[PDB]
Motif scaffolding. Structure first.
Motif, mmCIF file in Angstrom:
data_model
loop_
_atom_site.group_PDB
_atom_site.id
_atom_site.type_symbol
_atom_site.label_atom_id
_atom_site.label_comp_id
_atom_site.label_asym_id
_atom_site.label_seq_id
_atom_site.Cartn_x
_atom_site.Cartn_y
_atom_site.Cartn_z
ATOM 1 N N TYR A 2 0.686 -1.129 -0.095
ATOM 2 C CA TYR A 2 0.043 0.149 0.042
ATOM 3 C C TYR A 2 0.676 1.181 -0.031
ATOM 4 O O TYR A 2 0.450 2.273 -0.712
ATOM 5 C CB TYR A 2 -0.883 0.076 1.107
ATOM 6 C CG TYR A 2 -1.927 -0.965 1.296
ATOM 7 C CD1 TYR A 2 -2.235 -1.928 -0.014
ATOM 8 C CD2 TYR A 2 -2.892 -1.240 2.313
ATOM 9 C CE1 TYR A 2 -3.158 -2.779 0.047
ATOM 10 C CE2 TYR A 2 -3.986 -2.404 2.244
ATOM 11 C CZ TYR A 2 -3.837 -2.970 1.180
ATOM 12 O OH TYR A 2 -5.001 -4.082 1.203
ATOM 13 N N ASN A 3 1.828 1.408 0.680
ATOM 14 C CA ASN A 3 2.587 2.344 0.821
ATOM 15 C C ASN A 3 3.614 2.891 -0.595
ATOM 16 O O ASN A 3 4.337 1.994 -0.643
ATOM 17 C CB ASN A 3 3.759 2.468 2.308
ATOM 18 C CG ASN A 3 4.046 3.993 2.540
ATOM 19 O OD1 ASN A 3 5.093 4.055 2.830
ATOM 20 N ND2 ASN A 3 3.268 4.763 2.585
ATOM 21 N N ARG A 4 3.353 4.008 -0.741
ATOM 22 C CA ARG A 4 4.065 4.285 -2.168
ATOM 23 C C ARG A 4 4.075 3.349 -3.101
ATOM 24 O O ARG A 4 5.195 3.261 -4.019
ATOM 25 C CB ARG A 4 5.465 4.573 -1.604
ATOM 26 C CG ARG A 4 6.178 5.928 -2.420
ATOM 27 C CD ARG A 4 7.596 5.858 -1.841
ATOM 28 N NE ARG A 4 8.299 7.158 -2.630
ATOM 29 C CZ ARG A 4 9.007 6.585 -3.611
ATOM 30 N NH1 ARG A 4 9.389 5.460 -4.083
ATOM 31 N NH2 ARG A 4 10.041 7.672 -4.266
ATOM 32 N N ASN A 5 2.930 2.694 -3.525
ATOM 33 C CA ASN A 5 2.846 1.872 -4.455
ATOM 34 C C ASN A 5 1.776 1.956 -5.474
ATOM 35 O O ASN A 5 0.433 1.856 -4.825
ATOM 36 C CB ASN A 5 3.015 0.168 -3.647
ATOM 37 C CG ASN A 5 3.001 -0.844 -4.700
ATOM 38 O OD1 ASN A 5 2.996 -0.554 -5.772
ATOM 39 N ND2 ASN A 5 2.754 -1.960 -4.209
ATOM 40 N N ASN B 168 3.669 6.284 -12.003
ATOM 41 C CA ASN B 168 2.314 7.082 -12.328
ATOM 42 C C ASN B 168 2.520 7.581 -13.772
ATOM 43 O O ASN B 168 3.039 8.192 -14.280
ATOM 44 C CB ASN B 168 2.105 8.195 -11.383
ATOM 45 C CG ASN B 168 1.921 7.929 -9.902
ATOM 46 O OD1 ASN B 168 1.731 6.735 -9.479
ATOM 47 N ND2 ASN B 168 2.221 8.956 -9.027
#
Ligand SMILES: Cc1cc2nc3c(=O)[nH]c(=O)nc-3n(C[C@H](O)[C@H](O)[C@H](O)COP(=O)(O)O)c2cc1C
Ligand code: SF4
Ligand code: SF4
Ligand code: SF4
Ligand code: SF4
Ligand code: SF4
Ligand code: FES
Ligand code: FES
Lengths: 221, 111, 32, 456, 98, 147, 212, 105
Positions: free
Chosen positions: F1-4, F10
């Motif tokens: 979840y974190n920075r994924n 992006n």
């Protein structure tokens, strides 16, 4: 179209081809001058340029220099007049120079100049701007030629061919092609298909009575 | 790093905008018309001991020439090794182009 | 590439003087 | 309380419009021309100016200003205390698309113009006249030069014009193709052997004009009626049209009519009767009509619903947010591409701009590209407003009225045909699967790696 | 001498001999409980005979109000210290002097 | 979840740079009706020379005397001239103490209060600090909570 | 004699027969200009000096308007704001995006008067593109980049009037009007380099100074 | 010695805002103003006043400051424009004799 508005130094158009007005044209010049105040002789640059465009064939750089010399002008002041005005072919044109009006009055009246342009392109196998391989015709579209009630119409060299159908405008050209040998085959200038000049085809609705002259003027005169 | 177009032509055109905006006057540029009449730099120096690493120079570039690489590990034995000339900066772009392109790709819409 | 109506001889007139320019020859600023 | 139109044959100015007689001087004598010019000249210029002013005559070259007032201006305070010449410049350039009235005056009855210059010139105390013919009218100029030649021959104009003791010369000058040389000042500079770029007025020809001399430019029809205005009367001519609009008019009625023609008919005539009677009516009937340009290409378009009771009048067409213009009448059917018709005019003005000033040299090309896009729907509707703003930044910010001449036709199209502009913008969106961006780019331009600024 | 009002800032222009009484008035008056000196700086105007503009900034937490007082000095004219009314002005005046 | 995903993966096409309707429109904004930088306020400077004036004849808001037509202008310049010749202290000296009392009448009788800097209530005022409904340290610790 | 007018509310005197722009430099009133130069003839071409004048239906070119007896002139009204913003839009519509490669950058009247008098953003995005014209050879001294030309006529007036060198001109018409010599010829005038400084933009620049 | 002057308008622009005020600079000395660094070719300097200038509202203020600071100082006065009426109508004045030049607009 692709009419460059600078000079291209071609072997048929360079400042080395000599130009000199013919003696018959020289008499025409001095008539032109007498119509303008003497110190404003530059006012004749357009008449002389046209008079040089008809003797040489086109407004070459030498003809503009010749005119600039006669009228004691810096030749740039003549290069400006020639390039600003559109009746000056600074490139050579064919024996005939087809000008077809494609403005809104001539795009709606009659057939509407779209078939008239199509007929020209169909008859000559050329596109707009280019000239025929044998050099008889140059073709362009132009703006209102001042004969709108007689559209579709075309100007070839100095004559207006008005009220054109795509059939008649084809035979106007082929007449011009054969008219170079015998002058008797030259087309009749003016409108085609009946109408004499800006009339109403289905009879004259005005000025049908006997005209008046100096009959009705008051005693005061 | 100084960057090139896909043809190997330098992107830098010597406008001097980055030299003007620098807050630490670390950029010295000299330009001329090149042999082929092109507006190109003759000198391109960054004093890496004057720079403040703000990114204002890459912000101002009209053609994405000057960029700051993702590289932070370039510590040197002497300060002369930190005076980058055009030869060192083009070599940096020639080596780092794949990330410089991937960073610009990922970050361009926000610029 | 193609030919053209360009003056071959110095003395010859490729395009006629026209009716207008002739009427400048019959001109006269005096009564007859 | 009375209708204007249907004037009798014995009430017209240009009797030989339809080529009844050859243009020689002998036939013009039977026409009533050169009749009592002796008396007309010997009557002072004041008497000629009064007769012109009484006639209510307004300029017929597309602006409609009081010609009696105009020709008085060149009789400035000490007009007799200068050794400089004074010039009458007759505008025969015939530029407006749709207009062909003055080529018929010049060929059929040049003497109505050759004599007209004398009375026009005399009223203004001018020393000579120059007539500026568009060069494309070559036979129009040879015929007219023949009339001048014959007028010199019999002493009608020249040293002692008509034996009146007035000295007046008359010269033709032909152009080489430029619609902008029909402009007031652009005419003057072209005559001086310069590119026909118009001049700024505060200097006004009535003070400094041709060759820096006192000058007046007037249309051919304006000058071709003035002698008749005297031989028949100011009250006679002021008997037609509405209260502030008087006299007759020519009407070149082209376009989607079943019988295009010019006609001389009473000013303030309703347009439909003018169309439906002199020209045989709208092609395919009146219901097939969509829109009319009531002047030349320089006047805003008029939809079918306002044409029904429109007086062909200087003041009346103004209330329609249009103008009488040159009284050229281009009509359009319900089968017309109206934006194509307007865009062609926007292309005409791009080619006929001189290029001297910023608003028309940049705005005539910018407006042309927008119009060429709007034909094929490459744009979004809010650009229609953007094009409206652009025309209003040209409208009164130019050296000459050509800036108005290319901005007005666009504005009138926005005024009555925006849903047509909107309909084909919508169609192009569904055709390309997305609303067009500003400038004509497709919705996916950024997706295909194009350069699209925020807000395009 | 004068006062100016720009947006929400009120400036008071005074002569240097009145530094003590004016700041005494702004510290102790009921409607002028300006009990902090936020700041004391100078601005140099070499076009002016009195080069230096001494600008003090005061806060009144009682009235949620700020006020600016400006006086002038040069390289030889001194200014009365306000360290007797504002202990916090000690270091600001040292910065102006330095 | 974190920075994924990482910000470097992006998609660029997804983010859209935002333009506001008036400022960014192509047909409803001349720049000069939003050129708020060049509409900047000038400082409004009052000196003793025309504070005596404002006391002499009033103000466009609250005039003192009528100043009707001509012969009022000559009084208008005198109010400014008397300020430049004699200042505020001299002005209050000769009018006496009731002119000084009218000075307080300019603010309703009491001296004016200095303006507060909040305007969170709709008018520029002192922010009213109050004790917070919930006290994080309860009462156990010497730190109290204010709103 | 010096007549008396009011410009922007302030009174100014100036000799009659002066331009209204001239009365503005006397009254300390800044008016934008491109074609007008104090040392040249008035041309009236750019349309950047339009101001409001009473009894005048349309904005007047201040460079070409003779000062009248008692006129009232507004150089800061909504009329003048609207005109200067709109004329800037026209001069910047076919102007090339070459401010980085141009030698007039940082010393440009077009960017300094675009920043002061135009909108901050362009509305010109045509798929047809901008006008492009070919460069010219007018000798070894004056580098040409003619896409940049804004048609002010300052160099043609200087070359013809001041310097007596009537070789430079403007051939063509419309949006295709182009400054240059028709024939590719050198400019022979010892006052030649003065058109580089007169040029509002960097179309006529210095060859020895280029890019340095 | 310092120089006290009003900067003249640049030849390249028509804006005149940098001409409004009086500027005080320090004159370049014969040695030490610039020399080239052996290492990079950067331009070294020993003149600590080379990047400094003062701005004044009037000429008198500049003199007063330089007198009080002990500077040597030289003043140059600005060259003023010679006024002359300019008329658009001169472009088209009548010529009774030979046209001395052909105007081109
Ligand atoms: C672009 C433009 C073209 C014009 N073309 C003509 C023209 O071809 N013929 C004409 O008579 N007037 C033309 N005019 C109007 C003239 O400037 C002028 O008003 C007229 O010739 C003389 O004034 P009058 O008609 O009131 O007598 C044109 C005006 C403009 C702005
Ligand atoms: S801003 Fe970029 S392109 Fe311009 S000179 Fe500097 S590095 Fe080169
Ligand atoms: S990032 Fe470095 S080189 Fe770029 S502007 Fe900032 S300090 Fe200068
Ligand atoms: S409006 Fe301007 S560009 Fe258009 S023809 Fe007139 S002078 Fe030329
Ligand atoms: S002339 Fe044009 S390209 Fe050159 S700096 Fe100025 S705006 Fe930029
Ligand atoms: S080259 Fe320069 S001076 Fe000459 S017209 Fe163009 S912009 Fe004006
Ligand atoms: S539109 Fe073709 S002649 Fe008028
Ligand atoms: S400055 Fe007056 S129009 Fe160019």
């Amino acid at each position: 179209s692709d009419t460059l508005m600078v000079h291209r130094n071609t072997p048929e158009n360079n400042p080395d081809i000599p130009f000199k007005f013919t003696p018959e044209n020289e008499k025409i010049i001095e008539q032109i001058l007498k119509r303008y105040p003497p110190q404003y002789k530059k006012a004749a640059v357009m008449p002389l340029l046209d008079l040089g465009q008809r003797q040489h064939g086109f407004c070459s750089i030498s003809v503009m220099n010749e005119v600039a010399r006669i009228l004691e002008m810096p030749p740039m002041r003549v290069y400006e007049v020639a390039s600003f005005y559109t009746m000056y072919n600074r490139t050579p044109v064919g024996k005939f120079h087809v000008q077809a009006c494609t403005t809104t009055p001539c795009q709606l009246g009659g057939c509407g100049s779209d078939a008239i342009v199509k007929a020209i392109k169909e008859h000559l196998g050329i596109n707009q701007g280019e000239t025929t391989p044998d050099g008889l015709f140059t073709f362009i579209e132009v703006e209102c030629l001042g004969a709108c009630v007689n559209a579709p119409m075309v100007q070839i060299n100095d004559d207006y061919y008005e009220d054109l159908t795509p059939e008649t405008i084809k035979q106007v050209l082929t007449a011009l092609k054969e008219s170079v040998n015998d002058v008797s085959k030259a087309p009749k200038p003016g409108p085609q298909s009946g109408r004499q000049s800006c009339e109403n085809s289905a009879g004259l609705t005005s000025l049908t009575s006997e005209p008046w002259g100096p009959e009705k003027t008051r005693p005061d005169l | 790093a100084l960057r090139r177009y896909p043809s190997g032509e330098e992107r830098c055109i010597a406008c001097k905008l980055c030299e003007a905006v620098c807050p630490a006057q670390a950029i010295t540029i000299e330009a001329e018309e090149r042999a082929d009449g092109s507006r190109r730099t003759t000198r391109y120096d960054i004093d890496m001991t004057k720079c403040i690493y703000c990114g204002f120079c890459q912000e101002s570039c009209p053609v994405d020439a000057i960029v700051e690489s993702p590289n932070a590990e370039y510590a040197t034995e002497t300060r002369e090794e930190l005076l980058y000339n055009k030869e060192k900066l083009l070599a940096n772009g020639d080596k780092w182009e794949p990330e410089l392109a991937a960073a610009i790709r990922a970050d361009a819409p926000y610029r | 590439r193609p030919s053209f109506a360009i003056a071959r001889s110095p003395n010859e007139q490729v395009f006629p003087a026209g009716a207008f320019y002739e009427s400048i020859l019959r001109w006269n600023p005096n009564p007859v | 309380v009375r209708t204007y139109g249907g004037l009798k044959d014995q009430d017209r100015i240009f009797q030989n419009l339809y080529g009844r007689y050859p243009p020689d001087l002998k036939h013009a004598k039977k026409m009533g021309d050169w009749y009592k010019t002796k008396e007309i000249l010997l009557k002072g210029h004041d008497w000629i100016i009064g007769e012109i002013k009484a006639s209510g005559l307004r300029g017929r070259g597309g602006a409609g200003f009081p010609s009696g007032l105009k020709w008085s201006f060149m009789n400035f305070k000490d007009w007799d205390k200068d050794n400089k010449p004074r010039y009458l410049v007759v505008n025969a350039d015939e530029g407006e698309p749709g207009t062909c009235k003055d080529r018929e005056i010049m060929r059929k009855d040049p003497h109505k113009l050759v004599e007209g210059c004398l009375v026009a010139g005399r009223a203004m105390n001018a020393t000579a006249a120059y007539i500026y013919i568009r060069g494309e009218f070559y036979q129009e100029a040879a015929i007219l030069q023949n009339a001048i030649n014959e007028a010199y021959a019999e002493g009608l104009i020249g040293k002692n014009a008509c034996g009146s003791g007035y000295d007046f010369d008359v010269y033709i000058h032909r152009g080489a193709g430029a619609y902008v040389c029909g402009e007031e000042t652009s005419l003057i500079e072209s005559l001086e052997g310069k590119p026909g770029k118009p001049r700024l007025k505060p200097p006004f020809p009535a003070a400094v004009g041709l060759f820096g001399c006192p000058s007046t430019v007037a249309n051919v029809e304006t000058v071709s009626v003035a002698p008749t205005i005297c031989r028949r009367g100011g009250a006679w001519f002021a008997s037609f049209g509405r209260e502030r609009n008087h006299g007759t008019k020519l009407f070149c009625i082209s376009g989607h009519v079943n019988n295009p023609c010019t006609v001389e008919e009473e000013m303030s005539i309703p347009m439909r009767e003018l169309i439906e009677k002199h020209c045989g009516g709208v092609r395919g009937g009146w219901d097939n009509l969509l829109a009319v340009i009531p002047g030349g290409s320089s006047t805003p378009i008029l939809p079918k619903h306002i044409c029904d009771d429109q007086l062909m009048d200087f003041d009346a067409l103004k209330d329609s947010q249009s103008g009488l213009g040159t009284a050229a009448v281009i009509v359009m059917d319900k089968s017309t591409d109206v934006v194509r018709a307007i865009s062609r005019l926007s292309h005409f003005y791009r080619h006929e701009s001189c290029g001297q000033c910023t608003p028309c040299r940049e705005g005539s090309k910018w407006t042309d590209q927008i119009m060429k896009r709007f034909e094929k729907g490459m744009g979004r509707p809010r650009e229609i407003d953007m094009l409206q703003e652009l025309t209003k930044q040209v409208e009164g910010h130019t050296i000459c009225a050509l800036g108005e001449a290319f901005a007005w036709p666009i504005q009138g199209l926005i005024r009555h045909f925006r849903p047509e502009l909107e309909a084909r913008m919508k169609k192009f969106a569904e055709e390309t699967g997305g609303q067009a961006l500003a400038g004509g780019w497709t919705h996916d331009s950024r997706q295909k790696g194009r350069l699209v600024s925020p807000g395009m | 001498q004068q006062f100016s009002v720009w947006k929400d800032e009120l400036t008071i222009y005074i002569c240097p001999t009145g530094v003590i009484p004016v700041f005494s008035f702004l510290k102790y008056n009921t409607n002028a409980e300006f009990t902090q000196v936020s700041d004391i700086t100078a601005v140099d105007f070499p076009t002016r005979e009195m080069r230096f503009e001494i600008v003090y900034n005061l806060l009144s937490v009682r009235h949620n109000a700020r006020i600016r007082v400006k006086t002038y000095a040069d390289e030889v004219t001194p200014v009365p210290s306000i360290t007797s009314l504002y202990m916090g002005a000690n270091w600001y005046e040292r910065e102006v002097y330095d | 979840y974190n920075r994924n995903p990482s910000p470097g993966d992006n998609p660029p096409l997804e983010y859209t740079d935002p333009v506001t309707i008036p400022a960014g429109d192509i047909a409803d904004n001349p720049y000069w009706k939003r050129d708020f930088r060049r509409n900047y306020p000038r400082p409004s400077v009052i000196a003793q020379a025309q504070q005596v004036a404002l006391l002499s004849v009033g103000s466009a808001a609250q005039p003192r005397v009528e100043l009707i037509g001509e012969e009022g202008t000559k009084a208008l310049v005198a109010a400014e001239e008397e300020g430049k010749e004699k200042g505020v202290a001299k002005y209050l000296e000769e009018k006496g103490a009731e002119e000084a009392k009218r000075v307080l009448a300019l603010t309703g009788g009491l001296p004016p209060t200095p303006s507060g800097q909040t305007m969170v209530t709709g008018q520029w005022d002192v922010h009213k600090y109050g004790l917070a409904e919930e006290q994080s340290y309860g009462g156990s610790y010497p730190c109290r909570s204010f709103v | 004699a010096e007549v008396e007018l009011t410009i922007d509310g302030k009174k100014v005197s100036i000799e009659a027969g002066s331009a209204l722009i001239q009365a503005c430099e006397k009254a300390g009133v800044v008016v934008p200009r491109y074609c007008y130069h104090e040392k040249l003839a008035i041309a009236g071409n750019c349309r950047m000096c339009l101001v409001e004048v009473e009894r005048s239906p349309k904005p007047v070119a201040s460079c070409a308007w003779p000062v009248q007896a008692g006129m009232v002139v507004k150089t800061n009204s909504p009329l003048t704001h609207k005109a200067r913003e709109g004329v800037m839009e026209f001069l910047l519509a076919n102007h090339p995006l070459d401010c980085p490669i141009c030698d007039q950058g940082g010393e440009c009247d077009l960017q300094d008067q675009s920043m002061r008098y135009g909108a901050d953003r362009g509305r010109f995005h045509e798929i047809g593109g901008k006008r492009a014209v070919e460069d010219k050879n007018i000798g070894p001294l004056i580098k040409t980049s003619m896409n940049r030309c804004i048609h002010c006529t300052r160099c043609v007036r200087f070359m013809n009037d001041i310097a007596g060198a009537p070789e430079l001109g403007s051939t063509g018409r419309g949006n295709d009007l182009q400054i240059g010599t028709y024939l590719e010829k050198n400019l022979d005038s010892e006052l030649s380099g003065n058109v580089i400084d007169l040029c509002p933009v960097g179309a006529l620049t210095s060859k020895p100074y280029a890019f340095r | 010695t310092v120089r006290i002057y009003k900067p003249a308008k640049p030849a390249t622009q028509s804006g005149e805002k940098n001409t409004q005020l009086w500027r005080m600079d320090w004159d370049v000395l014969g040695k030490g103003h610039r020399w080239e660094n052996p290492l990079m070719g950067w331009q070294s300097s020993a003149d600590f006043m080379q990047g400094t200038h003062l701005t004044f509202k009037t000429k008198e203020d500049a003199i007063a400051f330089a007198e009080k600071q002990g500077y040597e100082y030289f003043v140059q006065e600005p060259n003023e424009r010679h006024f002359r009426p300019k008329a658009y109508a001169n472009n088209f004045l009548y010529s009774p004799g030979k046209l001395k030049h052909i105007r081109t607009k």
